Design an enzyme around this catalytic site. Structure first.
Site, mmCIF file in Angstrom:
data_model
loop_
_atom_site.group_PDB
_atom_site.id
_atom_site.type_symbol
_atom_site.label_atom_id
_atom_site.label_comp_id
_atom_site.label_asym_id
_atom_site.label_seq_id
_atom_site.Cartn_x
_atom_site.Cartn_y
_atom_site.Cartn_z
ATOM 1 C CG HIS A 29 -26.227 26.183 41.868
ATOM 2 N ND1 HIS A 29 -26.265 26.874 43.040
ATOM 3 C CD2 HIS A 29 -26.486 27.072 40.890
ATOM 4 C CE1 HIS A 29 -26.532 28.150 42.793
ATOM 5 N NE2 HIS A 29 -26.647 28.300 41.469
ATOM 6 C CE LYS A 63 1.110 22.723 42.710
ATOM 7 N NZ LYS A 63 1.658 21.551 41.996
ATOM 8 C CG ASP A 64 3.878 23.669 34.895
ATOM 9 O OD1 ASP A 64 3.554 24.891 34.944
ATOM 10 O OD2 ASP A 64 4.951 23.250 34.360
ATOM 11 C CE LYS A 65 -0.254 15.250 35.991
ATOM 12 N NZ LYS A 65 0.312 14.726 34.726
ATOM 13 C CG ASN A 66 -3.322 19.262 42.403
ATOM 14 O OD1 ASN A 66 -2.285 19.060 43.026
ATOM 15 N ND2 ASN A 66 -4.509 18.972 42.893
ATOM 16 C CB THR A 67 -3.373 14.118 40.580
ATOM 17 O OG1 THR A 67 -2.322 14.237 39.616
ATOM 18 C CG2 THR A 67 -4.198 12.867 40.355
ATOM 19 C CG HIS A 116 3.521 14.911 51.566
ATOM 20 N ND1 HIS A 116 3.368 16.245 51.217
ATOM 21 C CD2 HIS A 116 4.212 14.887 52.731
ATOM 22 C CE1 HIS A 116 3.950 16.997 52.134
ATOM 23 N NE2 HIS A 116 4.472 16.183 53.080
#
Lengths: 104, 104
Positions: free
Chosen positions: B10, B31-35, B97
């Site tokens: 919430h 996936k291994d990594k996201n920011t 990107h």
């Protein structure tokens, strides 16, 4: 690849909840309806300040509320944005359940 | 059922990304990594204010960033929180990107 894809991949709070992506996550599992509160945790936890026994409480002020409501197409939703009071169940001084918009 | 689950279900502005929920979506596919940039999109789009031709731009200030980092258990993640500058590819006055943290 583009602005809208950049938002979905790499930005976390457009207080314009992404109904179709969030509701199809395994926490919401394509359920009919969910209400999101635009706030930090602290003003929301404060609703339950000094309530120990399970009790339903209405906020004294309004918050920005994003409702996701399922359409006729399975797990596809329409976003409703409003400001309003809401009701939670307070247990040991913390919100444990969302009961309703506008009224307990 | 409990304060922690209530917040996940919430509260929109926790500054704490739900990695294990978000990263197992079509968008991130474990996936291994996201920011993630913790902001509304406006100050992020403004980075690209008046740039038409594809170009890499480093933010002039710092933003709150949250990395989801995969553990040795597939699609289980640890959250790292930091403030830093970042680089985006601007095309027609919009981020398209995410190039990287701290530098291009």
């Amino acid at each position: 690849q583009d602005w809208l894809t950049f938002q979905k991949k790499h930005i976390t709070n457009t207080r314009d909840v992404d109904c179709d992506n969030i509701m199809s996550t395994n926490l919401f599992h394509c359920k009919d309806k969910n209400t999101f509160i635009y706030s930090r945790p602290e003003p929301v936890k404060a609703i339950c300040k000094g309530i120990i026994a399970s009790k339903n409480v209405l906020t004294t002020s309004e918050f920005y509320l994003s409702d996701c409501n399922v359409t006729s197409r399975p797990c596809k939703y329409k976003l409703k944005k409003s400001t309003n009071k809401f009701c939670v169940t307070c247990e040991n001084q913390a919100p444990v359940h969302f009961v309703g918009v506008g009224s307990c």
